[PDB]
Write an enzyme that holds these catalytic residues in place. Structure first.
Site, short mmCIF file in Angstrom:
data_model
loop_
_atom_site.label_atom_id
_atom_site.label_comp_id
_atom_site.label_asym_id
_atom_site.label_seq_id
_atom_site.Cartn_x
_atom_site.Cartn_y
_atom_site.Cartn_z
N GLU A 198 -5.62 7.11 -8.95
CA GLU A 198 -4.95 7.60 -10.19
C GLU A 198 -5.67 8.82 -10.84
O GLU A 198 -5.01 9.75 -11.25
CB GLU A 198 -4.93 6.41 -11.20
N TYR A 236 -4.43 1.07 -3.38
CA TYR A 236 -4.04 1.03 -4.75
C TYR A 236 -4.40 -0.19 -5.52
O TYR A 236 -3.54 -0.83 -6.04
CB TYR A 236 -2.52 1.31 -4.87
N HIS A 242 0.97 15.17 -10.25
CA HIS A 242 0.28 13.86 -10.17
C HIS A 242 0.89 13.16 -8.95
O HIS A 242 0.19 12.56 -8.07
CB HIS A 242 0.47 13.15 -11.54
N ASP A 269 -1.96 -4.44 -13.83
CA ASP A 269 -1.97 -3.05 -13.40
C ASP A 269 -2.83 -2.85 -12.20
O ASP A 269 -3.61 -1.92 -12.10
CB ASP A 269 -2.54 -2.16 -14.52
N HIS A 313 -4.40 2.31 -13.71
CA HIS A 313 -4.10 3.33 -14.68
C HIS A 313 -4.99 3.18 -15.96
O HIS A 313 -4.90 3.98 -16.90
CB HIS A 313 -2.68 3.37 -15.25
N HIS A 327 -0.45 12.14 -5.00
CA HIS A 327 -0.56 10.82 -4.39
C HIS A 327 -0.30 10.98 -2.89
O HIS A 327 -0.90 10.28 -2.08
CB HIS A 327 0.54 9.89 -5.02
#
Ligand code: TIO
Ligand code: CA
Ligand code: CA
Ligand code: CA
Ligand code: CA
Ligand code: ZN
Length: 316
Positions: free
Chosen positions: A166, A157, A142, A226, A231, A146
């Site tokens: 994500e 982001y 993961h 967030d 996420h 990125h």
């Protein structure tokens, strides 16, 4: 470090024994010379200063409990490099064999892992919500993913483009878990999350709702936490990806599965050729349609499964 390439043995976070590529020069270092410009693992020594010290060991054996997270971050980063190179013909995250660096034992009871724009960082967890983060192959991939996004699409982001960022990382970390054949699944973080509870995970690709994440566009988080739910809303794209792959009926719409390999081929191509820093969910749809078209033809089943999947989650 300049020295002789050799091979050591160690035990990972989950207690599994593995061989890792090291370098010998007085001490044995966690430096793998066989992959691109090398894979380098560092000791952050419970502090926040990065990268910390190149990992040095006296006898090429990594069986101590403090060693476990360094062994798995070093080995899983080798697996990830392998997946990219072999399956997509990409040499490391920048496509030019950039060295891959990771630091373990970052801070005290740090319940996260991240890519800082320059290297990977893994906390050891608090022992209850998490165990050291590098013990999960999907967490490691993961992360590295990125790096890939950063050098390609460059998805910002936040908001829609961040949730895409994500989703891509969960998608490819899941492809990497299946590639390694390490008990694979469509769940994220299962191997290192809540050591005391069985059967759960951090997120679910198969049913994001299982943990409260949206599995439909109409259920998207519109707030501000967030980073605008990067996420959180990733669940809408994860559901779509899991449908293209495996197939199924969701909210009444039926999708014929095209399998994992094609799913990885279509997404990698959308990532590398069509997506931009500011792309939204709707644009991800056109990008994925166009990649599947490019690769399998406008009248392929491949193209038709990608449209079905997006209509199933309400994207377009
Ligand atoms: O920062 C968050 O909210 C949760 N973090 C994550 O989902 C990523 C950091 S972007 C680290 C991680 C990935 C996969 C599994 C476990 C941990
Ligand atoms: Ca040793
Ligand atoms: Ca698994
Ligand atoms: Ca998993
Ligand atoms: Ca658990
Ligand atoms: Zn992430």
């Amino acid at each position: 470090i300049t020295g002789t390439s050799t091979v050591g043995v160690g035990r990972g976070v989950l207690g599994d024994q593995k061989n890792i590529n090291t370098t010998y020069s007085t001490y044995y270092y966690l430096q793998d010379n066989t992959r691109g410009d090398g894979i380098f693992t560092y000791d952050a020594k419970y502090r926040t200063t990065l990268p910390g010290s190149l990992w040095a060991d006296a006898d090429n054996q990594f069986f101590a409990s403090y060693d476990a997270p360094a062994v798995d971050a070093h080995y899983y980063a080798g697996v990830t490099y392998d997946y990219y190179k072999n399956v997509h013909n990409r040499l490391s995250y920048d496509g030019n064999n950039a060295a891959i660096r990771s630091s373990v034992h970052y801070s005290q009871g740090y319940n996260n892992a991240f890519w800082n724009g320059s290297e990977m960082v893994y906390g050891d967890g608090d022992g209850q919500t998490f165990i050291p983060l590098s013990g999960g192959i999907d967490v490691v991939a993961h992360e590295l993913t990125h790096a890939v996004t950063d050098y390609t699409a460059g998805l910002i982001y936040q908001n829609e483009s961040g949730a895409i960022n994500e989703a891509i990382s969960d998608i490819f970390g899941t492809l990497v878990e299946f590639y390694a054949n390490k008990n694979p699944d469509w769940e994220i973080g299962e191997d290192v999350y809540t050591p005391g509870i069985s059967g759960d995970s951090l997120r679910s690709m198969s049913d994001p709702a299982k943990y409260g994440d949206p599995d439909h566009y109409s259920k998207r988080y519109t707030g501000t936490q967030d980073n605008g739910g990067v996420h959180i809303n990733s669940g809408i794209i994860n559901k779509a990806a899991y449908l293209i792959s495996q197939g199924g009926t969701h909210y009444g719409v039926s999708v014929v599965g095209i399998g994992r390999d094609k799913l990885g081929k279509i997404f990698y191509r959308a990532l590398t050729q069509y997506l931009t820093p500011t792309s939204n969910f709707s644009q991800l749809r056109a990008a994925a349609v166009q990649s599947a078209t490019d690769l399998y033809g406008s009248t392929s089943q491949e193209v038709a499964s990608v449209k079905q999947a997006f209509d199933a989650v309400g994207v377009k």
